[PDB]
Every structure is written in C-alpha cells, then in structure tokens.
Symmetry: D2
Subunit: 242 residues, 4 copies
C-alpha cells in the first residue's frame, strides 16, 4: 500500500476523494468550497484532498492554495505544465498532477517525479491502458514510490469520451493506486453519478471530481458520496483482487 497526505491509498484501503472547482475563483469562494468539502468527507470518513488550478494570476493563485492549506487545514493538489516552476509550486502544494495531454512526455514526467512529492499521473485519452505501466515505470525509475494512475476516459470517435471500465482493472498492474476522474471522462452531467458508481463497483483507490457551488453540484456531493461509499464497501467484501 501507498502512503499519501497522512493516509493510505489502495484497492484494499478506504476510498479517497480529490475534489474542488476547476479554476480558483476568489479566495473567499475557494475557502468556502474547501471547508464544505472537508466537513462532508469528515462526516463520511473519506480521506480528502482539495484541488484547483489557475482567472487569477499564477502567483496569486498559489497564495490562495497556501491560505486554503493553512486556514482550512486540508492537503492541496494542482496541475503542472512543462513550463511550470516546480520548486515554487512544490513549496505550496502537497500533490502534483500531470495532465492527460502530457502523459507521453517522459522527461517532463521524470522532472515532476523528481520533486519527491506524490504525483497523480492522468492517462491520456489517446492511451491504451497497458501503456500506462511504462509511463508509471519511468516515473518511479529514480525512487519516487508515491505515483498514482488516473483514468479520465478514452477517445471514441469525434467529440466523445468513453469510460472503458477494463482500464481500471488493467492499470492495477502498474503497482499503483488507480484514481477515477468522474467529471472528465464525461466531457452529459447526468452520467457522472452513474459512471462513478460503476468505477467504484469495479474497484478503485480514489475518486477525482470537479464541483460547482461538466461539474457536479456541491449540494449534491454528499448524497453521491454516500452512495459511492456503500458501493465501495460491497466491492471490498467480495473482492478476489486482493
């Protein structure tokens, strides 16, 4: 099993949630959302990681994540690009994430992993699941043992992503927790709860979700997570995968 932000991530461990809005709106709104999500997960005993990307400038957005981390007292995650200053971001956030469109940029992935922080590596929509083993293997090649593989859908014809549930099983061969992006593999909102239930019933380590105060409304998050936690318990009771 893998350690991450003070809790354990794994197929046999309790499901965790990466959630937050897409982009940082206001310090006031970001702190309200982060606190609301923290309490909801606390009332459901779900380990929680806050996420939001940069609207406000890069430096100002970094401060809002600094204030969320310190005032709300939650771990924070954000994306990085090939031109992101890794040391400045790493001195603020707890989890780095590589976007799907960079998943084949091996050396950028290696630069990200070299920061010695947990990395959520998003599978590209142009990738077959078995190809993730090599992407993940290159990320771990210098000792970073905190890599995760994030499923976000695969291209299906034009302007359509399909969630191939086999990918959740195949990517267990990476030796990493598999995270399911429930709000991006739709990119049409009424399918988000259905697909999240499917992924959790198949068996995953964590959920990734965008929330709205292709997003799931904040006032509907607790009911959905309540149904997902019950589905997760059923998977673990009958699991023959561990």
């Amino acid at each position: 099993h893998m350690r991450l932000c003070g809790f354990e991530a794994g197929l046999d461990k309790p499901l965790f949630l990466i959630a937050g809005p897409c982009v940082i709106e206001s310090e006031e709104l970001a702190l309200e959302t982060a606190g609301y999500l923290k309490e909801m997960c606390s009332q459901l005993n779900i380990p929680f990681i806050y996420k939001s990307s940069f609207g406000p400038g890069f430096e100002k957005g970094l401060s809002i994540l600094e204030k969320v981390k310190s005032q709300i007292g939650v771990p924070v995650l954000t994306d990085v690009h090939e031109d992101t200053p890794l040391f400045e971001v790493s001195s603020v956030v707890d989890v780095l994430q590589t976007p799907a469109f960079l998943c084949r940029q091996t050396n950028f992935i290696q630069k990200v992993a070299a920061m010695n922080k947990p990395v959520n590596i998003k599978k590209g929509q142009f990738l077959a699941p078995w190809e993730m083993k090599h992407v993940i293997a290159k990320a771990k090649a210098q000792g970073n043992e905190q890599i995760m593989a994030c499923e976000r859908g695969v291209s299906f014809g034009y302007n359509n992503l399909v969630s191939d549930m086999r990918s959740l099983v195949i990517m267990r061969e990476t030796g990493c927790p598999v995270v399911y992006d429930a709000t991006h593999s739709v990119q049409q909102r009424e399918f988000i709860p259905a697909l999240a239930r499917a992924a959790v019933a198949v068996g995953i380590s964590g959920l990734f979700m965008e929330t709205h105060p292709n997003s799931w409304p904040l006032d509907k998050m607790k009911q959905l997570l309540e149904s997902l936690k019950a589905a997760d318990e059923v998977y673990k009771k009958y699991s023959t995968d561990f």
Copy 2:
C-alpha cells in the same frame, strides 16, 4: 414495470438472470446445466430464464422443450430472418433477436407479432439513442413485452467497449435494460468487473453465457452472482432513478 415469465422485470425490481451455454451440446448437458442454474438462482432469490441456441433443428427444439418441462424453467433462444417463428414460438418462452439484425425492422416486427417477450439485442454499430427507434417500432403493434439488451459497441478494430451510459440512456425506451456480460468483452477476467459495473449503474437483468471462450465457468457462477446481488442492493438503496 413489465411482466415476464411469471415475475416482474424493472430497474426497481429484483435483478433477474438469463443464462445458459452458447449452443446446445447434448440433451444430458442441457438438463444438467439448466437444473444447476435453477438451484443456484432459487437459493439466491434471482428470477431465472434458461437460454441456448442452435444437434439438428428438430432435435434442438425438443431438448429445449424437455428442459422447460423437466427442469421447469422459462427458456429463451434467438431467431433469424429464416427461422420458422410459429414452430419456435410454440416451444420457447422468450424470443431474442441477434445484434446484427437490430436494424431489420420488418423482421423485428414479425418477431414481436408472436406476442411473446422479446429480448432485442443492440447492435455493436448502434448508438444508444437509436434503440428508442428500434424498440418503438417493435412495440407499435401492441407487444408490451420488449426488452433492450446491451452487448457492447465497436471500439476501433477487433474490440468492444462497454459504454455504461447506454444503460442509462436506454431506460428512455420504457423497457427493462438487460446487460450481456459475456459478449461486451468478446478477456474473461473482466466479465465479473464489467458485470459489477453494470449492476451498480442500475439494470433490470443480466445476460450471461456459462459453461462447466468468453464464457463464465459454472462452478464460479454462484460466487459471482453473490457479489452482483450485493451491488444490486446498493444501487436500489440510493437510486434516484425511481
């Protein structure tokens, strides 16, 4: 809410199972298989329909007739454009149209005109919203016992993907949605995973090929059905779809 073979089928009703071997091998094997599935399904409170396809055509019909009478179960089979419907319809309880015929409206209506329940399989070349048109014309003449069966959609060459959104969309037909768990991969390791996913999304019935290639072994059926029944209880508990 639809009635079928002495039980009711629906998203809010207990999950039912259509299962059996691909083709009828021997009368001895058919009675053993049908009897085995009957005892297992009865002990798990799962309404059960035995299925098998075409052993000469005349000989196969009596074997299904002997299964129906000796084992005491409803029986299902497919028919083609050249199947003598009255002869087949006078033996079996449920007709099924193969996926490659789903666009042959003239043939679908002839099948539905037998006034038996019909399991209409969606073609791998069909979008889910197209089943509304297939089912509507199938029901146009009063047959209120039509079901929609998902079996996967083409994904590039030599690959089927199970788009779980189809299970939600086809609810708009007003018919039970059946999930073919053994053809959506046609690769055996994913059968339980994909069955768990579909049941968690919410379906009316399961369709499974079982033998003691893309078949599930008979001696592993009960453990699998146990996990699917638990996932089905979780779906109905939190469902907002009924």
Copy 3:
C-alpha cells in the same frame, strides 16, 4: 489472378468498373430511364457498367411503412431493365430471399454488410455460381474480411468481390480507412469501393472516391438518383476519377 464478370474483366490492373443505380426501385419507367442514362454515360467513358437496384432498402423496412413494389414486381422490373436497356443488373439477397428466383433474373448477387458474418448464408449465396459483391460490415476489421471472402471462395466460385463501405467510428459516424483497400487485395479478389455509404456529408463523396481510386481499386459502387450522388453530376465525377485512375496505374507497384 484474373476475374471475368458480366462480359468484362475486373481487377486492380484492369479498367475501372461502376456499379450504380437508385437505392430502391420506384417505377418501371424510372428504372429504365435511369439505367439507360447511366449505360450511355458509362459507354461514352469506356467504363464497364452494372446497374443496381433493390426492392427495399439495405435495412428492410416494416411492411406498415414500406414504399415500393413487391419483391415479385421489383424482380420483373429488373428483368425488363436487363432486357430492354441491355445492361447487367445487381441486387441484394437476404437470409429469406429465394436465391434461385433472383439468380435466374439478375447478373450479380450482393450480400448486405450486416450479413457478412453469416458464413452459412454467405456459402449458400456463393453456391449459386454467380458473381457476388460481398459488402464488408462496418464492424469488421479488414483482416476478418479475408476469412469471410475465403470461405465464400473455398469451393471454386471465381467471381467473388470484396466491397468496402466504411467502419464504425464512435457513434453515428463511418470512417473510410484507406488501408483496407490495400489489405483486402490479399483475398485475391477485386476490391470495390462504396463511395456513397462510406460517409453515411455529400460534399465528401467525390473526395473519398478520388482517394480510393488513387489508392488503387477495381471498381466503384455508387447510389445515384435524379447519401446518393445526383445523376447529372456523375459524368464530371467519373471523368476526374478516370484521370486519377490512370495516374495510379502508371506508377503502381502493386501489380
């Protein structure tokens, strides 16, 4: 490998031929007029021609909403086209079609794309010892078409053709993978390109036909009516295809 068909030769190295016509037979008058028009146009371009028409669409419709003549009346109209206009005629056959009746009238049988995996039925069609245009299902990979074609040819029918019509690309979309035109040459049969169904959006019909002809094919299949191509634009299109076909044959390394 050389193949004869309706009095002419079909092949990657042979002149391009055309299967064309309306989807369904409307009237005897309309079928004879259309067939006669295409016959003169193809003769004046030196393009071997086969007229095609069915009594119902490829996906047969409910009788409660069916527009057209009977199976029997449609068969008679094709006989008069063959006889009055003097052209070879092609039509579809389904699993419930009387093959001997259709075979005694038409020159070329055609199996629809949705039946390509029905080996039993394909073998019965090939047993008629007539030319067969076997359409590739949108759910088939090109290498699977070799097995479909091979089983049809396994007992000596030397007039089998492979017809490409596009493959499923996500929902409600067909893509024309030009690689299949190359792969299916390995069946040892003429490859025919369905230019009006590979889109099933009309703007692309001439473009996709040019592409297929430049890749190298044996024949063209086209739906034309006055995703059908209009009858009064067929000649300009065919003229540009012949120029692209000559260029393909001049530099070809495939034969």
Copy 4:
C-alpha cells in the same frame, strides 16, 4: 494565396514537402540528409523545407544546415522552448500534436511572426481546428498551416479520415498531410499519401530514415505524388 519560405502554399499551388529525420543525430548526418533531400526535390521541382527536432548544440547544427545546404529549416517547439532563440535560427515553427489545445501557447508561438505548422491532435475533430487556427491568427500571423496526422481509432491505432483534409480548408490555411505518422504498417505510407494528394492538400510532411520512409525510396514516391497532385489540380472545383 500564402507565402512561405519564398514559395506559395495553397490548394491551388504546387505541392510542397516538409521532410527530414526525426531528431538531429550527427552534424554530419544532418548535412548529408538535408543535402540529399535538397538535391532530390530540385530534380523534381518540388518546394522543400528541411525538418528535424532537438538544445544549444542541436540549434547550432540546424543553422549550419540552413547555411551550408541552403534550405529552409523547420523544428518543433514546446511550452518551455525559448521561442526567440529558435525563431532567430529556423524558418518555420511547428507545434506538436499534443499541444494543439493549449490555446495560449499557440498564440505565444504565432507571436514570433514566423510561419507555423500546427499539428492537429489525434484527439481533435477537424472542425475544432477552425477555433485553434482562429486563435493562432488573432494577432495577424497570416502564415499558419494545419497539419493532419491521424485520429485515434480504438487502442493503438490511428486512422486517416480524409474528410478532415476537406473540412480544414474552412480554416483558410494550407492543409499539410503527415504521411509518415498517420499510421503510428510501413507499406501503407505511399497508399495513404496518394489518397491525401488526390483529395487535395497543400503540402506533404514526411519522416525519413537513411514508421518512416527510406530516403532511397523518396524520389519514386514523390514522382507518383506529383502526378496525382497535377490530376487533382486539373479537375479541382474546390478553388
């Protein structure tokens, strides 16, 4: 029409060629390959742009290529590439397919006021290039081109939807066809290149090796492509 490295690019203009090795291997090898490709294109009267990708040492070889061989040079740029340094050396910038949806990066590249070959991602629908190109031209760069490289088709397969070559004419830009990556299987490169040329394109993009086409088979292939291009231009009603 559009000007590019001293020649005109367009559906109605003669076909041009971007060609070269994937990455700079040797200074010696780059000069030989660029010289070989330059000679071949002259014997066929085909406008030619040399391409290879990389940082300081690789950038230096491409200038010696530009100066010794006397050909225009093209190279890729990434989000962290210093654009001004590369732009002061090469003649044409190229954005890789995986960056096409990074709108702000596309504009930073186009702001160099050099011609730019924007590769369509394998995950993009053709009609989406209209939006990508519009943002690229938004600050006046009238030297943008759209490069087709295939679209994802299931797992581990790229298919060339020839319709995209027609659709992308609506961007108002020359459409370039990548004949050596739309496969990513080597026997199909000439077949697919012929098809794209018969559909009608502005230029060819090709990876060469002394999923690449051998350098000693380039001339026979290009000879057949120029003939197909002439036939397309003779009957074209698209311009």
